Amino acid sequence: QWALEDFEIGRPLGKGKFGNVYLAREKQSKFILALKVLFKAQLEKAGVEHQLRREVEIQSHLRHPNILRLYGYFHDATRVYLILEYAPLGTVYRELQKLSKFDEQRTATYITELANALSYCHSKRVIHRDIKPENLLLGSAGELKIADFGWSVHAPSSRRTTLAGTLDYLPPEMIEGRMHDEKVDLWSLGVLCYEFLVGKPPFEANTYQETYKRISRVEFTFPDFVTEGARDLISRLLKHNPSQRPMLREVLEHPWITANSSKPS
Numbered sequence: 001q002w003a004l005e006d007f008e009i010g011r012p013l014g015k016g017k018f019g020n021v022y023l024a025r026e027k028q029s030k031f032i033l034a035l036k037v038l039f040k041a042q043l044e045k046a047g048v049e050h051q052l053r054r055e056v057e058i059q060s061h062l063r064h065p066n067i068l069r070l071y072g073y074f075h076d077a078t079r080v081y082l083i084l085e086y087a088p089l090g091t092v093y094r095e096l097q098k099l100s101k102f103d104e105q106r107t108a109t110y111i112t113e114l115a116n117a118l119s120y121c122h123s124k125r126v127i128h129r130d131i132k133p134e135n136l137l138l139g140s141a142g143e144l145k146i147a148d149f150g151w152s153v154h155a156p157s158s159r160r161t162t163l164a165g166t167l168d169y170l171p172p173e174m175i176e177g178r179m180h181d182e183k184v185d186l187w188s189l190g191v192l193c194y195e196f197l198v199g200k201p202p203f204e205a206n207t208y209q210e211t212y213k214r215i216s217r218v219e220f221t222f223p224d225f226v227t228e229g230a231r232d233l234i235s236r237l238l239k240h241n242p243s244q245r246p247m248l249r250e251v252l253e254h255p256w257i258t259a260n261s262s263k264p265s
């Protein structure tokens with residue numbers, strides 16, 4: 001079906017480990033979209049074709065206002081192309097670099113949208129496992145959308161693929177290579193809530209080795225400006241024992257979230 005000749009390519013939107021993403025326009029319809037380009041040589045060397053397949057299967061079937069749509073894919077002799085919904089307000093990562101910290105209303109609203117999207121995923125026992133700011137995009141009305149489902153799986157699960165860059169958003173069970181489930185995403189949600197309010201993630205350190213230690217021992221502290229309500233919610237999500245982390249409904253009804261969020265469940 002689709003081929004590269006069907007699109008006009010435009011400015012670069014971002015670069016991932018494997019993804020080179022461009023603005024594009026479909027010629028016959030003028031439909032604007034994001035084209036995610038991957039090099040087959042690189043996929044083959046890293047042995048991660050299976051991740052690209054999970055991404056296609058999961059994101060093409062999901063339908064939720066806070067999850068990025070994947071419309072389709074094609075490939076030629078050297079490259080694979082994913083056809084994605086275009087997110088015109090960019091990444092939460094960029095927004096955080098711009099503002100340094102988010103206020104309590106902005107933070108609680110994003111957390112609400114995240115929890116809504118994740119609740120829909122967990123209802124199918126789909127865990128994302130790679131929730132971080134560079135994979136959270138913003139729609140035309142500023143609404144948050146989860147993207148990059150390449151690390152996702154069905155619970156429960158082990159890990160068979162080599163970890164990549166930062167450990168900052170992963171729970172103890174995941175970095176220690178143990179069995180894991182939906183509760184991995186609840187940990188990441190606590191890491192995000194802290195990073196949104198403070199400007200850096202709670203276990204950030206100078207070295208991989210030190211970051212590993214801070215995570216496995218759950219060593220974090222709060223600056224004075226973080227309020228009692230935010231501290232309660234974050235402390236509940238960042239528990240070593242997964243079964244002790246709250247249900248998403250409990251996040252959605254937490255008094256700090258309901259007091260500060262501008263969006264509903």
Ligand SMILES: Nc1ncnc2c1ncn2[C@@H]1O[C@H](COP(=O)(O)OP(=O)(O)O)[C@@H](O)[C@H]1O
Pocket residue numbers: 013014015016017018019020021034036068084085086087088090091134135137147148150
């Ligand atoms: N649909 C999109 N709209 C706008 N920007 C995007 C879109 N998809 C990706 N990007 C940008 O490209 C970057 C890499 O995309 P991603 O799908 O995360 O690739 P990887 O799988 O290599 O991490 C993102 O962090 C973001 O900056």
Ligand SMILES: O=C(Cn1cnc2ccccc21)NCCc1ccccc1
Pocket residue numbers: 049052053054056057073075080
């Ligand atoms: O891998 C395939 C075909 N293929 C088999 N099972 C799949 C499930 C989902 C999508 C494609 C699938 N070869 C073509 C290149 C390619 C395209 C998409 C992702 C990876 C690689």
Ligand SMILES: [Cl-]
Pocket residue numbers: none
């Ligand atoms: Cl169409």
Ligand SMILES: [Cl-]
Pocket residue numbers: 157158159
């Ligand atoms: Cl497994």
Ligand SMILES: [Cl-]
Pocket residue numbers: 158159160161
């Ligand atoms: Cl894996």
Ligand SMILES: [Cl-]
Pocket residue numbers: 119247248249250
């Ligand atoms: Cl729930």
Ligand SMILES: [Mg+2]
Pocket residue numbers: 016134135148
């Ligand atoms: Mg990514």
Ligand SMILES: [Mg+2]
Pocket residue numbers: 016018148149150151
């Ligand atoms: Mg990926």
